[PDB]
Amino acid sequence: MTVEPFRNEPIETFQTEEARRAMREALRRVREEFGRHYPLYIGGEWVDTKERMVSLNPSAPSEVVGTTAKAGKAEAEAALEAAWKAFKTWKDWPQEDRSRLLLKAAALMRRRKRELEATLVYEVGKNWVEASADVAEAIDFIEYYARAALRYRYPAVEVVPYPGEDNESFYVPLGAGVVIAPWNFPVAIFTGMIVGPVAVGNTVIAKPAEDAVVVGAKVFEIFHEAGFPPGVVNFLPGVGEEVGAYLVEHPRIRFINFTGSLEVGLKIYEAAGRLAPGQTWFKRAYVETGGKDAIIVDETADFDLAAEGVVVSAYGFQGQKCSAASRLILTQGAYEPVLERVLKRAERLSVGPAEENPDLGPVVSAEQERKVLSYIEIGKNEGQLVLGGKRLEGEGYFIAPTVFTEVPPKARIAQEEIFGPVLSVIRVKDFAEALEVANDTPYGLTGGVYSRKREHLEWARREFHVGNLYFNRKITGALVGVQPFGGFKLSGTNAKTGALDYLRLFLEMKAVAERF
Amino acid sequence: MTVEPFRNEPIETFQTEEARRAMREALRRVREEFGRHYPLYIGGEWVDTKERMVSLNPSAPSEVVGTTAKAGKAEAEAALEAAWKAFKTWKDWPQEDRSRLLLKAAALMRRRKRELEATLVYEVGKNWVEASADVAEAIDFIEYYARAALRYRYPAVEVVPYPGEDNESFYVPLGAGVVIAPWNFPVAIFTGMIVGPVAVGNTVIAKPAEDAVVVGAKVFEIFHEAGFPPGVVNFLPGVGEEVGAYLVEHPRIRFINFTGSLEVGLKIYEAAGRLAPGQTWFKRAYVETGGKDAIIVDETADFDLAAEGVVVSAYGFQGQKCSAASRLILTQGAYEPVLERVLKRAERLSVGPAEENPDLGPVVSAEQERKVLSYIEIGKNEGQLVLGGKRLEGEGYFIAPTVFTEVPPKARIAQEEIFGPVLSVIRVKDFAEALEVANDTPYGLTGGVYSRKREHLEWARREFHVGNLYFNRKITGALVGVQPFGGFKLSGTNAKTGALDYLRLFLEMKAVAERF
Amino acid sequence: MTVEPFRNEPIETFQTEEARRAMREALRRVREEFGRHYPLYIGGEWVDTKERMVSLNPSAPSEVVGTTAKAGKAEAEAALEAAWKAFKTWKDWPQEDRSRLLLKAAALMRRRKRELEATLVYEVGKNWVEASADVAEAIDFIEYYARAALRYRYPAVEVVPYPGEDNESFYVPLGAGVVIAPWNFPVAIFTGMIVGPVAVGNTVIAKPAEDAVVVGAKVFEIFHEAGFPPGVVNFLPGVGEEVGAYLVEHPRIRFINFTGSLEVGLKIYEAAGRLAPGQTWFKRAYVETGGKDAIIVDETADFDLAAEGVVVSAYGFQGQKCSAASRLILTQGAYEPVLERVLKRAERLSVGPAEENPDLGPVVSAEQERKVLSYIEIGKNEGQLVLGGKRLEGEGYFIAPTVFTEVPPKARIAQEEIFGPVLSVIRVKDFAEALEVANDTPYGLTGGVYSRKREHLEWARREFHVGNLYFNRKITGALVGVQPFGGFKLSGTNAKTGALDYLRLFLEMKAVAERF
Ligand SMILES: [Cl-]
Ligand SMILES: [Cl-]
Ligand SMILES: [Cl-]
């Protein structure tokens, strides 16, 4: 297999008339199909159920964007049977063949970019560029993992020779596993978590997040058209913990790939450590569990650049990112200049229906709104509210960009992942204290430093204990291939997505010697 | 750092007078040193305790090889504090510096080879060549990991460039962890499990197996002489579960490296999945948990070659190997010729005090003897006893080479790891059935095939589901570098020792971007 | 550090309205700041002096373009102390960190391109594209040396292993040195000569040429903003030989990097060979000392292409280039056709104030004008004046494109570097004689051949003894990375700028063995 060197899919900015026209057409097509029903996908076919799940438009929650089938334990078991049956032959496909299948899926997804973007807009409340970045990243995962998988092809392991013998070490896939995907990047991360394991010969049962079932189904339309053999990829939308719990605890689930809340991640990791009755392996569980990410700014920084980066990082997709800047740590010299600029920029941000391409759409659901508002109430007792902190008018879950100042480093709003448009500003004496405050959370996902001082930057490179660190730029939007993505501490297991190392997680090694 | 290409340390056969002279002197000096007391090693110093542990000679258990201090929770806590304190600076040593320290330790161990071999002979009942192979493998781990660690040095990660930015991904060590080592390779595997993590910047608290505490202390003498900084490696001999449980469950233990029984491995993996109160990471646990390893022989094999390899694999170090051939699976045409040859060879094996360099020494302890004898009783009601099946006369824990035949594949003696000189022979119709029977256990560590038929060998290459597979040779004695060692299924987490991939297990990745 | 593969900075052609608008705005900003005073830069701070230096506009020499401080011996000593103090820690920065610092400086310079170009226009009389090429090359040196330095990182040397030992060879920087920079490329070469040594851990005291002190100061503004630690780079504008002589002869100057006249280069090289009282090393001196560069044209050439290349090479930046075509060597068959075309093109060239983007601006100074006019008088006695040879009207130092024909190969104007718009045309019998005449000067910097005859080209490749040879194109404008730049013979020490080899000149090697 020889293809062009990997490049990232360009993120559409919609600065041309053609791009804007194309988006409007896609938004129209998608909403004309709001009445659509999407079944489960099990063993190469769409399989419907009696019960259904409804997906709402968070910008207008009285509007249904689609319905899906609803998997229970029986359908989970059917999918598991199909996945193991498929594994028996899928594991033996030449890598070149599996990689070509991924490349086909990427081509198909690229051809449907605007459609998927418009679905993100209506289903999960992404503005236009957030939607485009999401789909572009999905394409990137497919393109990148297709290529990366070839690096592991038979026989890939470097061994020391021995006289009179062939010694051959090589990788083999694990088996059938479960993917539990997030609602915040329900094309990108949904896709990456499935296609990584699948690329190297595993099979996957995927549970989309409840809030993003329609767009997950559309991704499955792509997998189906690409022609993954029956059972290799399976789609099980479901309500609550039933489907996920059943699979995570199953003796015949080989691995679990999870991205979501720490609460759920902790339960999954604990369950994975147990031997279910009749289980014949040690389960692998990969969990990516969010962050409490800070941007540090010191007095040497470009304060305008810092303010812009902070606003993008804090409020892009309404702060609903594992990488979102939820803490702003300012040294004394930087405090007033940076805070004033942050407030000025943030107060100018628009909030409204996502299809209108506002700076912020709504938060994703009534439950998310409740959680964010509850944290805003907690914050009023811990820090000083200086901007936003309110629900905005309309049935859509519009919350204003929110800033708290004078926040104690150990306050709940300075420690707990709010996953909404809520920034906590912490004043510190100097850069050393800035690093101390940055490090003192249970998390370790993203972090940023705005500074011109080389010694501060290089010190942070060593000592700011986060998996993805960025200097003099936004701390969100990690690009596949460029910035291996994954954290430390309670941000999860450091499974670095969009990196060569990711695929190794879904392989085991065999060493075979022949004495002639 | 530039050194000679890795080569395996030659295993001494003691066929020259020089080698015999050197070994006799080493054995005499070790024997003359019986009763020596060895303290704990914590924070760069030897630390004694009021309570003590006794290590017996299994060939003559009235004889005390030595005693050691005995760690409890307080000493475990002291070691953990020392290990984290050391980690703060050890993690920042240039890799070349850490690797040179390992190379020094290897040089010191090589200079003490005969002494360490002699200590294994007396303390764990290895004959002379088994002792030499053990020490040689320890030296190999040090030499190999010293070089392998350099492959991970700053900044090692291949990433995709991005305009206007430096993107730099690199590995960092995890922290302080615990090593729980086995009695059966208490120089080799004890050393490997410690020095691998340490090479790349971790710190380690090591608990030797109770039956092998003296030789563990001697390895620590080498570490101390080599000059590992205080706290980098710590030695905590202990009785029963206390030290191990306290460390495995501790919120501040970062990783656990375990080799031993499945029963204990299962508890460790489950405990590692839990978040202890105040814990701020997802623990990594690496477990290697034994096997129920088979050699298949078909009617095309060299039956004499097969019989010799089976006898070596089954009875080397009294069958007390995770890799030991405990099942012999014979196709119908191979059954009579191979079994007759195996019985003829096995009945000639000598058994006696390890110092006499017999074919078999004693099993390691009174408890091990009890277990093996218990399994022999079980075997008598499951298969047909055709050789051995008894304790021999004498105070030492001597058990005769034992063979059961016409053993049902699902018999306890065909499924459960006995870890003694007990071979179960299973008669099958053809090679297809041989593979079925071979695969149908909870384990997947080592396996072998004796066959001249290319199609059978290549079939097994794909379908015999074990991590370490050998054709037309013994299935024991995996060499560092040559044969990455580790299994599938309930043989553990497939942490391949003596391979480049091993060190990756003790590192996390950081990705740092600077936008200029 | 992973950045995009090196590419050369595009040279602006000003063919768009936006580019022209941008230049006009930059010219306005620069002239509004003609009243500015620029201090020395020593130990991380701007340090003023009582006395000052004035910089004039060579297109209007009654107009001051800026003033600077004026360093004497005391300030040179202060800078040397600061440079050695800085060296003690700068030498120990990881290469990745030093390279990132360079990349930052390049980014800052790129953002200030038009400003620096406009300063070159007003201060040294470059037209628009000459100014853009100069700044672009400066950026190229920073980008290229940042990357090239990583090729030398610890431990870079390939050595033969020896049993029982680590053998590690690696590079270390030399110390503090002095850079003596030219006026003709006072952004590009000024920058390259400083940042090359600095990249690999040296520290530098830089003396700008008197005619280009303002633009040197602006380059130092960039270094300051980039955040080079105090003492790493120092800026010492000065009048006459005082500062340069003091530093070149100093026992504590480790290396000297010089570009300029042969007269001065010869003195520097001789001084560098001496042991100053108390000196504890052998000084390294790198000198690049100009040329007497010829273009050969034979009768097989594209005469129109040749004429254009000759005019560009002879008269670009008024012939004030070490690489300038100052000799045109024509075989008999090429003589009339090429000369006629050269005269026709040259007579159409505009000469005037540099800001108007004429083909030629003024020569750089009253002293340069005097020298060029004096050579024109010498030429009238040696060859036949056929074009130009006159000062043009206005206070600016405008000299007409000048051509002498029938010039004897050993004439002063055919041997001595005029460094002005003066071309000497020499008629020869054939290509062999063309090469003989081309080679018979004390110099060996650039050379060109216009010919379609493969045998002539490949013969010149071997036998035309110049460091930078060009076929069927101009002989000026060597690009960083593409064309390592530096000559033979009295053109200097062959320190190839914009090449991997350049950085080796500023390093020494250490070999460290450890016997284990
Ligand atoms: Cl870190
Ligand atoms: Cl397998
Ligand atoms: Cl030459």
Ligand code: NA
């Ligand atoms: Na929705």
Ligand code: NA
């Ligand atoms: Na013992």
Ligand code: NA
């Ligand atoms: Na000037």
